[PDB]
Symmetry: D2
Subunit: 393 residues, 4 copies
């Protein structure tokens, strides 16, 4: 498996660029020049690169420097042909954002945070980004009395709707994608899972251009099924972007290589992204973005091995998932378990609630004890998937 | 603290009625007659009782028996004055529902499950229930390939919309409340948290009469902040009912007495139910339903002590939460931390996105380093709440 | 992959015999005759069968009944050739054990529980069992004030030393294996993890014949690394038995087929059982016992498929783990990463503490920043392992 | 509540000195001069101060610099009267320790790490410290194949026995306290929980002067009962020290003020430290050390308020726990529930195994169903405890 730009594999500048400082220690690697990053990613088969405003342009940088940095950055995009599909803003690193960007208790920080996002939408448009991600990493609290919970959501809505209306007013060809996270760095983050993110978007004025940017590790920190989560995002037509990585359990966010976390769940994620639904339905056609961090124990060879590893892992899984669905033993097992049977409507065309109630065969003369004898054979179906995954079928 | 019917404290028949069979052993207590239950609850100060169809009427019961059981049941309501504010259906105990009610892979079980719900709406209306709860406990899977995830949600929508349209057609004065649960008994349940529940309702045809029925322990099984969750349900105008209990961690669902789980979070839950939001906003005015189970180690004295305990716990907490908010030291601490400041809009009346961007004072001439020096004093604010909670202020 | 008795696959009678009742519902399968489990398991390739005293002999069995039942089970054993490597006691199902057996608060119950175990040692001995498992499932509490925690451990020790003393006294060739579990059925169980099990054994008078029976799902319920836990048990030479199953996260104990949980972790448990430690050390050599439950969704074909799936899962992993370590590329990766270098003593032959602090090369003139440049390439090594696991290598 | 040095409240220099940097952002506070921490903590009521070698003396300090810094810190100690009960080593911040100190894969690094500890023992000894803490934060792995798990424990043992041997050899009055932690900064840390810590100590040559330093948040990160864990450490007489803080769930280690986490659990830890075991047993008598971090949202008033909050939280809990056990109603509840009955041996004075199995009253004619009728009334006892905790009693 060798990735090619047609695979649509994008990487964030901060991923490979992650130097190793964790809470208990300092960087273990030297800074990675962004132009070096572009050249190396492009040679590995990457289609595009994403970044946070401050990943490329320092917070203090003068206008001269911004322009200098951008010019070299754009040259490298040109030299290689790497695209920039998604742009995001850093509203969490600087001490000013310690209580949040949009939901900062301080009004002057909320205005600063929002102006930072508005300027960043202009650079996104300029770069050719199709998606603008918003990860509200410091929106939340450690203590329950720190915030007025309704005001926190009024304030989150106000910023997202202001950013959304601004895209609409300039006619930028951009969608906003919100990224849910249960905790870390805040004790409790607002919009903690895919569900809260999706619900939130239905209360927005400009909801039509606001979707989600779910991350594997993030849902797994709440012990949720990532494939069930993305399935619901997809079903709602809100799966706008995706961040792929690995996590081994409910603990700090590990940010491992995709596939180095929960392997079986990674296989079913690849099956949904690549194959979609068994009865047919929506499909996710966007970039396959890897949002991970190369372990601080490894040197730069490990950084480039790690980036290669995301792509191979995904291609190995895809192959196994195409073999699995194409298998006639599997398709027949699927039939036995009712996968296709779930696809038929419960009610007959034209039947009503009154009709169903009063139909003796569906209720009053229904043999519940006979219907309960059905062997759904979910275990055997699950064993077929694992054997395809182990490359044994 | 002595509860009175004005406190609006409701109990499920299955709570006090829980005999003690867990996965590792059999009942430790004798069945509790429902008429005994009504009389005992009413003498403890309860306002109402709730039930699942099969809690009162056996699955096999003939029509004669149903009528016999209902007549005695209604007599007891009359004798005591206990109301029946919520009714629910058991779509999880019988072997026929082993793959689910509405999302059963088998079509004949989906029709049986839905007819069961439609008949149960009629009894709910007849009883005077204002809420019809739906806990899809067996909707989900253990294995990711068991279900077509999009079809599972089409099928859940079809049943909830069929039940919703039926209420509308008969003009019953009832709302449907969905109850999210991450897992148990299924490995992964569909609509696992408040967020997924709320999101789901926005895709329904009859969404206007569908809200939620969040449960303390259920959100805590995903390690979520219950007060943040209910705050978002409230903010959306979807907090239709509430199930209160305790849970100590991510583990099986314990169903302890409210307040015997995460005590500090219980205090902030009571503050939101009773006091609402600091800047003002929505309020939950429904019943305070306790959905717990008296520990299998205790005999019937423990059952009635446990039921008393829910009410006292809630009243103790309420008292402490009224003292806390009424305290001028607390109100001034609140002011210092920006609780009221979060209530002001980010943008000035009439200001636009373009206006804000270009306002030098909010961005280009904004001193980020000076604004980051602010002592939010969240720790001291949190210490004030705990001291009010410990009954020391 | 086809298991043969040489593989040592053992199954508990309660595993394939699990009926399907859980907290929210009744049994979905009819009881399994023990004769039939024996014959069936002999046909699939099982080496042995294990049981709890009440799996086989009812609580209330008369003497004549006990004899018939053992006559029937000994006949099956003789006819099939299956062995009985482990026997355990049910100190959790009867309502008498609602607060524990050995650590029950009631003294009369502690005495009955120990008497129930003593009698079971005799039976274990008559079956030709090598291991006697102790899973104290009801030993614990829901509430912190329910127990005197120092008295609970003296009571546990009393119990286990009385049982060990008796073994020695009767001259039985039986070792006791204690099975840790963090929670369920109690809120908190005593001796919650492998480490707590090992620690307790060292306070025992007859600790020489007492070791552990760690189970996969149990350790994963506290979020621990099951392979790290059994390596510590192995290292102290206390790994007497093992229970293999799958667990998908911190939640109720799922009891899935081995490998249907955390796959990579399963892969690495199989490497440690098959290959042992990279630098040499003790090796586990007892039964590979499966303590799982066929999902309640599945009918009896599912039951024998699930039994089979355990043994295939193990044989596919074993095939991969042996290929993994035989690969020259992997052996090279391991060396690079320092896996063999970890096996060399830190100190030199006859080097004292004073000698090493004195040595200037080791400390005072040690170049900490050049040593920190080593690329351990742990990511690459992990990628190699996963490629072997996926059968792409 | 006003703490006095008689209370034994000790604080680490790194606690109040924590600057605010985390994974997603930079420091929000300026460095704290150690002289100032000493004076400030003496003014709040602290009994002592603890530190890591590099909290005080920079990694790269010259000899002259080291002397100045110790002269400055000894002067502060002399001026304030504060003691130095514990000293620890930083084997996690330098990039050299990226794979561990003691269990690093690189042998040159293991040697430097142990040399770094030996030198620190001398310093500990010169400060008049009673305890030497060992927190192996970088000992572990992200990936299962990175380590030889039997070799990692031999390397750990080597390290800890070399340090213990040296203590004995120099005649220092110092005990080693090992501090378990399940994860963070590594994916999986070696000796993850109190039980694993205790187990390992028993494989040590010089285990007599090696015990534990359990921390509240660490045990809660695996979801364990912190009070049950320290009771097992106490029971084996291995509770040498303790680190108190708060943790709200299975997630990153939060380091909140003691009591700002799980309150009820905190209540019950304070009862065990203050009141000991209901039936008598060992009692903990060392420092009550706070290893927490003032939230990064708070400025320096917040820092001294947080230091204060730890000691008030402890004194409010202590006040409640002493009142709790003094209450005649509580003493009665405890007796009813069998808390004292658990403290009676199961067997009679000189009763053998054979004697008890023989006794017909204990087994053969034991009435299991009448014994099962006991109401343990654990719920009522829990309600009494929580009412004492809320100061309503
Ligand atoms: O937890 C970190 C988040 O994953 C970010 O990397 C977003 O994807 C971009 O701000
Ligand atoms: O987990 C069980 C659920 O809480 C139910 O009790 C619903 O509230 C009613 O079906
Ligand atoms: O959690 C259930 C346990 O795994 C038991 O089956 C033991 O293995 C033997 O009682
Ligand atoms: O997880 C961090 C630890 O608690 C440390 O502060 C130790 O207590 C000493 O290194
Ligand atoms: Mg991301
Ligand atoms: Mg409920
Ligand atoms: Mg087991
Ligand atoms: Mg600590």
């Amino acid at each position: 498996v060798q990735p090619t730009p047609a695979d649509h594999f994008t990487f964030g500048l901060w991923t490979v660029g992650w130097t190793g400082a964790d809470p208990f220690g300092v960087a273990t690697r030297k800074n990675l020049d962004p132009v070096e990053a572009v050249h190396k990613l492009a040679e590995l088969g990457a289609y595009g690169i994403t970044f946070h405003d401050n990943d490329l342009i320092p917070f203090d940088a003068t206008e001269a420097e911004r322009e200098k940095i951008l010019g070299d950055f754009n040259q490298a995009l040109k030299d290689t042909g790497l695209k920039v599909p998604m742009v995001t803003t850093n509203l969490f690193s600087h001490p000013v954002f310690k209580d949040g960007g949009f939901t900062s208790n301080d009004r002057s920080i909320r205005r600063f945070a929002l102006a930072k996002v508005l300027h960043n939408i202009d650079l996104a448009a300029e770069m050719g980004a199709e998606t603008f991600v918003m990860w509200g990493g410091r929106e939340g609290s450690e203590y329950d009395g720190s915030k007025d919970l309704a005001a926190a959501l009024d304030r989150m809505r106000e910023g997202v709707d202001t950013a959304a209306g601004y895209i609409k007013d300039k006619g930028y060809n951009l969608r906003i994608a919100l990224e849910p996270k249960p905790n870390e760095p805040r004790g409790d983050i607002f919009l903690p899972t895919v569900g809260h993110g999706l619900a939130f978007i239905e209360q927005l004025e400009h909801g039509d251009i606001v979707g989600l940017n779910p991350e594997t590790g993030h849902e797994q920190m709440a012990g949720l099924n990532f494939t069930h989560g993305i399935a619901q995002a997809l079903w709602a037509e809100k799966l706008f972007h995706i961040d792929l990585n690995g996590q081994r359990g409910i603990k700090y966010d590990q940010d491992l290589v995709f596939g180095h976390g929960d392997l079986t769940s990674a296989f079913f994620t690849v099956d949904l992204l690549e194959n979609g639904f068994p009865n047919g339905g929506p499909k996710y056609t966007g970039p396959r973005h890897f949002d991970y961090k190369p372990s601080r124990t490894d040197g730069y060879d490990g950084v480039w091995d790690s980036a290669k590893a995301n792509m191979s892992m995904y291609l190995l899984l895809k192959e196994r998932a195409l073999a699995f669905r194409a298998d006639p033993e599997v398709q027949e097992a699927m039939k036995t378990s009712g996968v296709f049977e779930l696809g038929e409507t419960t009610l007959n065309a034209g039947e009503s609630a009154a009709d169903l109630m009063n139909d003796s065969a569906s209720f009053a003369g229904f043999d519940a004890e006979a219907a309960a004898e059905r062997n759904f054979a979910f275990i055997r179906l699950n064993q077929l998937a694992i054997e395809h995954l182990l490359g044994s079928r």
